[PDB]
Amino acid sequence: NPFLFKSNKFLTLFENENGHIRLLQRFDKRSDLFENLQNYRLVEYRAKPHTIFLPQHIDADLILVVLSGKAILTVLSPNDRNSYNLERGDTIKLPAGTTSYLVNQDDEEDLRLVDLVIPVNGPGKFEAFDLAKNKNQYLRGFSKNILEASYNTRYETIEKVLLETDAIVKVSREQIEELKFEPINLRSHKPEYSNKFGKLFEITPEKKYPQLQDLDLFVSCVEINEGALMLPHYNSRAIVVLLVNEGKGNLELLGLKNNEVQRYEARLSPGDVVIIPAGHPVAITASSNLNLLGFGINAENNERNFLSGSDDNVISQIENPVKELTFPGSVQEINRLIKNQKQSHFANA
Template sequence: EIQIMATTVKSRFPLLLFLGIIFLASVCVTYANYDEGSETRVPGQRERGRQEGEKEEKRHGEWRPSYEKEEDEEEKQKYRYQREKKEQKEVQPGRERWEREEDEEQVDEEWRGSQRREDPEERARLRHREERTKRDRRHQREGEEEERSSESQEQRNPFLFKSNKFLTLFENENGHIRRLQRFDKRSDLFENLQNYRLVEYRAKPHTIFLPQHIDADLILVVLNGKAILTVLSPNDRNSYNLERGDTIKIPAGTTSYLVNQDDEEDLRVVDFVIPVNRPGKFEAFGLSENKNQYLRGFSKNILEASLNTKYETIEKVLLEEQEKKPQQLRDRKRTQQGEERDAIIKVSREQIEELRKLAKSSSKKSLPSEFEPFNLRSHKPEYSNKFGKLFEITPEKKYPQLQDLDILVSCVEINKGALMLPHYNSRAIVVLLVNEGKGNLELLGLKNEQQEREDRKERNNEVQRYEARLSPGDVVIIPAGHPVAISASSNLNLVGFGINAENNQRNFLSGSDDNVISQIENPVKELTFPGSSQEVNRLIKNQKQSHFASAEPEQKEEESQRKRSPLSSVLDSFY
């Protein structure tokens, strides 16, 4: 019997061997698939995994809390992301390490983002952040559109300089100094303005612009606030209390300093600058510790001989050697423009009171001397009615400060909804600064006026209207002989500087007084205009106001009832 069994086993041995080989092959394939989908584990980790698997099998079918299911789902998501990162590394082994790290950070951020979106509070925060981002982008677009609109205005109107054309020369927490771009760089029309510049100063309450002198004549006008201006000469010192509208000439090379003595209001000042060394270029030389302190430029021997003192003492008292100061303090005193922060500094109330004791008020009744300030609003206005006022100081004998410069200074106030009637200056080129308010300006010139004289034969002499929407800080150039009209959408305050002011005359084109057209004799009116002299006179007399009037006519005439004429075409250019 045993022999029979042995014979049977022996005969079936090939079959058993074949089945064994198939079994081993299937086991190997299964193990390979399992190992491909899992991370490499050390033997200890395999054992712990086996034990955890046995525990999971025991828990299978039992009730589990929802948060445990969420944790398992979260673990699965983590596992999937990790596997994706591993596969990405294997597929792209040649990529730079920093590139792979960026991809990993992006995947992690996507995973964290998906988890945050499931939190209601986080969703609310994300929604608020998205709304804020949209709002910021909208404001940015609006600002860019406004800037493009300003640039478009300037391209269409070479006479307009928007407020963003001021370059910041100095700025810190106490104030700033800004200079307008050169006039002659904009257009050949302003070639005669090559040697004139405009500078604006702003200072916080209880601050001082430290002593300096400039190689240029200055005409200073206080736009807003209260100041103490001290002007030094070799044997004298004069201090003045200045307020809005006060004007003073500071001759080139005069050392001066300016204090904002007000407790609450910012001080705003504008300088009309006439350089004496180089056309259109000027420099400020300061006595305070900055890169422009001219005392620091002299050699030790010159300083010791001039002051009859050892250099160490001079350095300690006047120069404040920077090398001995802490680096942190020097860094803190730098601005974005590379200047020192001490061009405008704080001043104590006690120091202001001491300076105020020696200061005189600007001349309001008596005629000013050559160096004393005068107030634009202290005298009777040139023109005044319920719609507006114009104050003007001209280079006459009673204002000797302006005689040698041949410059006039004016202040124009136009009430909301009013109009300064069309007019032109006979000789003066006016630089007009918008101090406060908003309005509209229309200036008449000739088309292609900027072309060279050689092209004059080909030029079109048709009248062209240049329009400008006025805002605070804007500057407009009004050439001599160019008619202009200004309307106010809010109370408008303008400050003007007129060049070639001597014997200048302002000629109005409408209004009951100072109307140059009304002075034309009747026979010449009939030769000049298509209408009769009676019709022209009647048209002119429709405006009962002078110089300033309402921006809206009292009654509108039908276009069919009046004939087109050169007079009406000139007047209609302003409407």
């Protein structure tokens, strides 16, 4: 099953008392096949309460998605600063080469992020430059003679004041309090699909979401209730990177052997990733409340074609005389069978 990236394919870049940063394997490492996803990666970020992710710049456009917790993200330009209050379901673009830091101002609740990483330098090449003091503070890379001229300060002072502590450090109540375009929330609009059985929330390329147009990207939240099914469908255009945010379930992804059809099975678990390539029929069942985050690559004009249920059911659209010829049953047996599923998009499993 090449479409399944289990949670352990997340390489820990950094772990301590206060949080962890994990990067998912290059999609195009294990097999070719995702040569079109070669310039995307996922990062999981988790931080304990009253913590700060210290000044760093990454050589990638990032789309942040907050799964849990509350953050102040501060983004620096050369001559300017902007900070954004981040909530559950908030997404924002953290552009390439922006020095930024990330406060978890909540008192009890962990901050959990997933980032879509779009590198700028080499397809999928994740590069991070640490301004603050680590083993890897980049300012230390400059020779003494460059620093001394650069800062017009004696090296010894540059060393004592700027140069010589982990990457996510505790911040105190006084520092939090003293710290004091916009995020688009997946849920501050009516869900696209909503049902006793599930809901799908989606922000897609439209004027209104100019950044999603430019990156040609959708961010979906899919909820499947215990014992429900996301009814079979394919995306017309989009390649969906599905991260399992919470819950367990199972997934039937139909592709080819890679003209024969192969069903590709995956147990689903927190932190697991599945690629659903465009046009690949997929069915999803939750054994507990399942919360999926989807990044839809090549999103413009994407279109969920369901193969059962009343809405968004492309089979319904087949003219009757062609229905007669495409399936073994009569028009009346086919139209009746298709009416037996009263639900749309989601349903009992």
